[PDB]
Amino acid sequence: VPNPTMPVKGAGTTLWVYKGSGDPYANPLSDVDWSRLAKVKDLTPGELTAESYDDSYLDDEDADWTATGQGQKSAGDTSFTLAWMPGEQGQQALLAWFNEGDTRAYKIRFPNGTVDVFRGWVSSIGKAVTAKEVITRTVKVTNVGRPSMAEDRSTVTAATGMTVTPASTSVVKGQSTTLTVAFQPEGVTDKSFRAVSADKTKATVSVSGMTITVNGVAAGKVNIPVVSGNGEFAAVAEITVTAS
């Protein structure tokens, strides 16, 4: 099961092109009105740029350090090479796209359920032929407008369903207690936590596997505060330890 939160291998990224008449950005997930550009040897998505714009004034009291601001953005250039199958549908449509020279929508589907949707017009159709190597039809499209990138269709949650399950028992020397950090705003959250003791002179704490380990090397009542966000929620676990 792909998770858009962990690094992904980079094989299985397919590439589609619109053929219908709607707005591709609305539901890029669905592949109903999208043709699949088959047998993609290699692709390289374009790089989103923005040239510099000066913000320097004669009256400005500085003149040694440049001041600049984001100029006008530009959505790069997407270049991909596929195997030459001239007579199969999906390549003749592409050649028509180039020779009639108009902008249509295309999308890149990573193996995450995250799809980068662009729109553009072909700027270069090529082909490289050598013996003993599959004839490559090469393509490059210049994008216009602004892609609705994958980060735009992600969602985040902070619905405050957080709790900490303690032990609060007389932890012995040579043994470690486990306290659990329940992290669910009904299923899905998007935040981390930091748990640290209140003494750091009698007992020690550690965080692993979302849970917190306490070693009471010395006795007394030891407090473990756990805080998340910038202080959205915190829990104080009280632990007792005797000399044993």
Binding site: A11, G12, T13, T14, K39, V40, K41, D42, L43
Partner: protein, 130 residues
């Protein structure tokens, strides 16, 4: 899948003429009795992964001829000119399973170990999908 590959190749070869002892995978040490031993096998079957969206593999498919000890090298050729090449010009079956079929080499080897078998190997380079 490789079973399908060598299966198609061996079946075509044995159908052409059953005048030889045919081997699936390289024999380790031969006997003195089998000979005109035509072996067929694969080497270096590794995931090149040149094609996105799919898992494509590339391997060196060997067709080898084993004939006694000191036969003239031109006799090794004469066997392959008749029994191997005309078949391997077109192996319809095999051609279904693969995507490309490139000739790579044709080498003469001897039993440098003892001296029992002499051999000529015709090596193609193939790619396919598992």
């Amino acid at each position: 899948k490789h079973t399908e590959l060598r299966a198609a190749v061996l079946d075509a070869l044995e159908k052409h003429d059953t005048g030889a002892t045919f081997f699936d995978g390289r024999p380790a040490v031969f006997d003195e009795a089998d000979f005109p031993a035509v072996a067929v096998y694969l080497t270096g079957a590794e995931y090149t992964g040149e094609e996105l969206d799919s898992d494509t593999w590339q391997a060196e498919l060997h067709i080898e001829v084993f004939l006694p000890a000191q036969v003239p090298d031109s006799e090794l050729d004469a066997w392959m000119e008749s029994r191997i090449y005309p078949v391997m010009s077109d192996i319809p079956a095999l051609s279904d399973l693969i995507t490309s079929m490139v000739a790579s080499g044709y080498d003469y080897r001897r039993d440098d170990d003892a001296g029992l078998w002499s051999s000529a190997d015709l090596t193609y380079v193939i790619t396919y999908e598992m």
